[PDB]
Enzyme design. Structure first.
Site, PDB file in Angstrom:
ATOM      1  N   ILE A 103      46.667 -21.739  14.560  1.00 55.94           N
ATOM      2  CA  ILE A 103      46.712 -21.618  15.993  1.00 55.94           C
ATOM      3  C   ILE A 103      47.942 -21.057  16.770  1.00 55.94           C
ATOM      4  O   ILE A 103      48.732 -21.582  16.539  1.00 55.94           O
ATOM      5  CB  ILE A 103      46.022 -22.932  16.651  1.00 55.94           C
ATOM      6  CG1 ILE A 103      44.950 -23.565  15.911  1.00 55.94           C
ATOM      7  CG2 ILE A 103      46.250 -22.944  18.043  1.00 55.94           C
ATOM      8  CD1 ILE A 103      43.784 -22.573  15.777  1.00 55.94           C
ATOM      9  N   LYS A 104      47.851 -19.967  17.463  1.00 52.38           N
ATOM     10  CA  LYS A 104      49.047 -19.343  18.245  1.00 52.38           C
ATOM     11  C   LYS A 104      48.782 -19.926  19.538  1.00 52.38           C
ATOM     12  O   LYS A 104      47.906 -19.653  20.390  1.00 52.38           O
ATOM     13  CB  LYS A 104      48.811 -17.795  18.328  1.00 52.38           C
ATOM     14  CG  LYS A 104      49.790 -16.902  19.064  1.00 52.38           C
ATOM     15  CD  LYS A 104      49.840 -15.743  19.015  1.00 52.38           C
ATOM     16  CE  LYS A 104      50.615 -15.051  17.943  1.00 52.38           C
ATOM     17  NZ  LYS A 104      50.379 -13.451  17.767  1.00 52.38           N
ATOM     18  N   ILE A 105      49.944 -20.590  20.026  1.00 50.14           N
ATOM     19  CA  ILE A 105      49.698 -21.214  21.531  1.00 50.14           C
ATOM     20  C   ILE A 105      51.300 -20.683  22.022  1.00 50.14           C
ATOM     21  O   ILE A 105      52.327 -20.588  21.588  1.00 50.14           O
ATOM     22  CB  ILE A 105      50.080 -22.602  21.460  1.00 50.14           C
ATOM     23  CG1 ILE A 105      49.241 -23.158  20.267  1.00 50.14           C
ATOM     24  CG2 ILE A 105      49.798 -23.471  22.546  1.00 50.14           C
ATOM     25  CD1 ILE A 105      49.460 -24.499  19.571  1.00 50.14           C
TER      26      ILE A 105
END
Lengths: 218, 218, 218, 218, 218, 218, 218, 218, 218
Positions: free
Chosen positions: D88-90
């Protein structure tokens, strides 16, 4: 480089002027205290000793308890009227930089003293102070370095300021060589700091080798 | 080095001008907001306070919502007609650098503000802006360094540009000493940043030692 | 790197502990003053808030008027008996380094604060202080640089000292990045210094570009 | 050094994996937009293409409009359940670093993206993010330098952080050589940046000299 | 440091192996051309000369006209079957790095040659090439510097790569001292570059002074 | 610093000249190809657009297939006769530096292009070329550094050469800031490289803060 | 650091061994010439003086007129059979490095002398020479610098070579401090260079101050 | 920078003068040997080829066996009487610097050659030699560095010497770029060193890209 | 740079003046001792040898046993009356700097010798000494470095002092190249230090190669 004797003793001021060619004399409430003589007496002697001498600045600090720029201007105007060689020394404080600006506007030479940062040195320059005295020895005694001196020299030069930098609280000839390497205008030091700075062990080791040769020669 | 008071309060502008010799005043929509007075009021007061004063630049930012160079030129021409000391402050944006070129061609002094890179600073110089304000504090708050200031000073010098650099968003006297060491022309700072920059603990430690000596002296 | 919240407000200490993972809390007589609550009250709240929490140091400064090491040891022993998380903060003074040596010998963790030189930092390390807080912001406000921090980190490392360095008086995230680049163990900062350090304009410019793309996508 | 293909096109991901030995794939809302395929489709294809492949991270950014850490955790938990290769890229925002800490606590690998300072990179490391993506190209397009990358590498190393640095927005092989010289763990680049980085004019000039020799030889 | 003779002449390979302790031999289509002998002949001689010799790598470049990785793998497999000392030399080209990855997977040692940047050197390392030959002389002849060699050595070391760097196109012993100062594993040079590197004028001036003394001594 | 638009599109040349104050225009066979218009057409338009404009150099490359200096002089004399603003662009090749010397002797301004070393840049200066274009982007795409640009600037300055350096193949505003920091005379860049170089995220973050303040003000 | 006496006089070798703890003795055809004694005599005396002494290397140069490695091996084998402390000194020449490789293979310790470059020093290391003597004084007398010594030390260390470096032709204690600062294993110097290196003028100036104090004390 | 052709072949001297604008020609006993023609013949041809040409120095070395300054002055006076373009080349030897001082006093231009240290270069300058040729290639072949060239340039400049430095034994265009970066007045190189210095692979890679574009254009 | 012969032997002074163009002669009680002749005799010979020669300074040290400035002024006035070329050499001692100030005031040129620090060199400059001789060799023999020479040169230059620096105790041509690189005005060295400084082994190696070529040429 100018060599200002940081002393209130006239036996050392007289010697250094005739033998070392000192270019001026700086004093502080502590040096006048160690003089043993009362303040006004030290001033009268300094005023007569260099009555005619021109270009011999004699920095004299006003009452250190003064807290108002107006009280510092009334006290320093009186001291400045005692001799044309006297330069009023004022602390780098809000009321001391307001008093140094008024003094410089009236033509009274001022030496903004107790400067320990290049930011405290720039304002004295922005108001036309004749001298700014950045202290070295005090900061070192507490374990602080002093290459803020080069910054002040570089800033003064970059902005073409006429204020002359007097590196103060010097304790050895290596600190006199540091101020000279930076480009400081004047260095103020005690009589003994100047005497030892002119002496090296290798000069004595060398003079013994030359004294032995002279003897083994016709 | 010039010391421009980054304030819209005339009690602080009046004090700094009479005691610190400030060379100018810079304002932004945020400082006029904190003034409490309405914008046009702040301007009328600044126009009268320095009616005759010459060489006292008063940077005034136009409507920040303006998006067309033509709307920024109509708004800044009106503000500039209120006083000869007023310098229209325009953001470094496509329409703000087109509006700053038209303004400078009509002889209206402009201060291209909100510049955060040396590439954003070069165009303001290629169009003859009177001032370029590179910001420091904002970038630092986000963890970014600011030695792009030396690059701008060096570029401006290498290409003989007349635009004067106003290092802005300064928060301490060490950042004022960084701008001076770089060679920046002006530094804009709040009243308190300037007051503290003129004060050191070693000046108070030194004044206590000199106050004790003065007392132990006749 | 540890992130200690320099605050006496428990709404900010609670938030930073649950969202930012702060590793400790430092307080000074000035922060407890701005708390509005009385000192003993702030302490009772801090003691209950982190009753069980282990490895959460809470630096608490003793009476700043204390001048005798024996009076500083009687006052800091009482405060330390209020919670196992409390670390007695003592000023780097002759009687504060004598009191910090006695405290550390009795097993009471001490944080020798108000250190502004690497020479003042070495003695706290020679007596086994748990923490040494070298201040940065104060010196900068007076126009002084702060790369004495790297010296302390290097000295501590060269001589294998266990004392943990808490860079204090931090005002921006660039100063947090300077302490981290030096190798400082902990950095103490106010809630807002930490919040802004986690935010960049290019993150908002980038999130607008990604929000436009997401919208132009099925 | 790891070579992650910054692409959402599976013809380029398949080629680079079989011929260049790419070690992973990073995507952003802009790359999925240029894919032409709908987001969920790109994900299904990536999930099947590398169903069994282990140690092949596939960074996938969640809805960029999300503003609450709880809404970012519900969206990224769903995406992470689609494949064990998905990371997951945040964004590095208050609610994106709170959501990255919760994700990492639940064992969901996170890639804190849009980091443009070493202060924004340290918090992702203090919360155990699997990856931190410091961007280079964007800052350069605005005239900003990027040797904050070495600072992040040095900080990460000095404090023994496990977070792997993915230098992003790379546009040429000289920037890939800058990241490798710094010690960055991974470099993410488009297919064409990698192809040209493996080609030099002197290799073609040299191959012509060797082709002429081979011909003039039995 | 290893000293590989960049020659296809077996009179110079035999001498350097018995007197200079060369650790290997590198050849290119140009050196086999200057041999005068046909390629397959040079190979048969090299295969017999070092039939038993172990740890004596003999780099042999495949057809330089080859453009497909599959045609480079069929040609280099045949050459490699002629001797266990032979190391297939492949150009750093798209089809030469695909062919070097397949070769290394089948256990055939490869020397990715014609590398003129640290970006072209990293891929050969990411595919497990036995050797990577960065060229120096060619780039210098066109007025280009070659401290990209230190970058490759540093990158290889930072990422623990086993690929051994063979600095090639060396023309003088000062360039051999530059490669050794960088930390390069091997240096390939012609017979005359090695001979002159072992000779200094001051050794002859010194041997004349020692020859005069020996004569004036019983 | 001069800003030359590296474009063959007259909508972008007209805009940049009226809004960005471009000082010249450079074109290559690739830009005229992307124009869509035939070469002679692009030239006729450029000749009329700037018929009277003085000091607006328009670099135009001759047939790239030309291999004889005499054929390059006959082709560039014809192109130069089409407008007084046209500067014949010649490749740095044996026959291109012989043709550039003959051209400069006849008073036809020449721009020796495709220079990738300081040795290739010195000869154009030794023959009085009006411009020398050292390329940056191409070398970087292959993983090569470009601080040979500072060498050329320093050499040109040390030997008082009048040839003006046009740093070419620039792709970002940081490379424009690198050329300006070196002292390059001109920088040629595409329209979009110049537009983005004048834009920063912190200018938009700052304009939002100023737009909020303006609104909360009467 | 080892201190090898560069002398063939046994009155100075005996003194330095008993009072200065010399670790070895180096001789050259010039020192044996100045001995006055015939060569074989000097050797017999050195062999008996240190008959039992272990770990006391005595470097002895073979006939300097020898030009064949085979004639240098027959002469140095005979000299080496005279004492187990004798180390055959061979010039860094083609036939002297071939003879030093054969000698080292037969277990005869060799000192490859007259080395004036780091390229001439690397081959002696590639053949397992026990010692390599890089000369300093000679090169300096002709106006050449000698920081090739650090290169040899660094190369030897980087490639884990066992050859011990003997910096030779040393003329002062500052050159002994330069070799020690570099990391050289041994330094060979004449008796007087070692005596003066242990003496300073400030030690005599200091001993006079301490002698005056002792006298003014009970 | 001046480009002197280090050749005795008049086909290469004629070409370089008409196409490369060489500023002079240097020759040594080795180049006249490789000419094939007898010495006096080479001189007669050089004298006629440049009979009228002014400011075209032709350095010609006298008999290298000469050992007396008086025999070097009688031989060089005769050679100098053959053409006004001839500059007598004398070795930097005791009798060659005595002969160069007498020559310069009689108005015969001299080129003190074979200088390999800055101390050997200063005396030629103290006697008014027209040229001093510091050699680079020879020292490098033996593994020695050559940044004594910058020292000579700096010394010559610091003491305002008119002697022009001719960096000799140059073998590549990178060494020509090193001499130019130092500030050397002239660089002497063979015809092929100059040809290759004007050629780069990226110029050929770039000309192929421009040739493809030209073709895909009307 | 001036070359002063540090000798009291008139066979070496006569040679160096006619062949090396020495600019002056320095002597010390040790050199007159080694002359063998009595002091007054050496002086009479030096006075007649250079009776008319102008601008040829001959430094002559007074009695080294002198301890009073008045006794040093009576002795040096007598010596100075023997020749107009004589410059009284005085040791850097309290009474030697008082005597050098009186001498310089009476117009007698003085050379303040035995200076081993930049602090001991500044006073001689503050009193208008004609020459100041900083010693190098002595300090080095005791293991001390000598880059205090650059400090003196820089200080002298920064403060526009006319005193000329004579670097003394030089023992090799590399120390002559160090003084020249610093900017020292004069260097005093023995006859043999100057002879060897003009000789290199590579000049002899080069002259043998040129002597072989001359022979193999008609």
């Amino acid at each position: 480089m100018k060599y200002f004797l940081d002393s209130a003793i006239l036996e050392e001021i007289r010697y250094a002027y005739e033998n070392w060619a000192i270019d001026g004399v700086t004093t502080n409430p502590r040096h006048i205290m160690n003089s043993g003589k009362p303040f006004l007496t030290v001033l009268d002697e300094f005023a007569s000793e260099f009555k005619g001498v021109e270009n011999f600045p004699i920095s004299v600090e006003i009452n250190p308890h003064l807290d108002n720029a107006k009280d510092m201007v009334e006290e320093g105007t009186k001291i400045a009227k005692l001799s044309s060689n006297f330069v009023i020394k004022i602390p780098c404080t809000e009321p001391g930089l307001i008093a140094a600006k008024e003094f410089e506007k009236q033509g009274i030479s001022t030496n903004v003293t107790l400067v320990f940062s290049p930011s405290q040195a720039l304002q004295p320059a922005r108001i036309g102070a004749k001298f700014v005295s950045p202290f070295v020895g005090w900061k070192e005694n507490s374990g602080d370095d002093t290459t803020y001196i080069q910054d002040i020299v570089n800033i003064y030069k970059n902005y073409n300021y006429n204020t002359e930098i007097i590196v103060a609280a010097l304790r050895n000839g290596k600190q006199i060589v540091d101020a000279a390497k930076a480009g400081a205008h004047i260095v103020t030091c005690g009589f003994d700091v100047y005497k030892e700075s002119f002496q090296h062990a290798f000069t004595d080791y060398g003079l013994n080798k030359f004294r032995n040769a002279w003897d083994n020669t016709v």
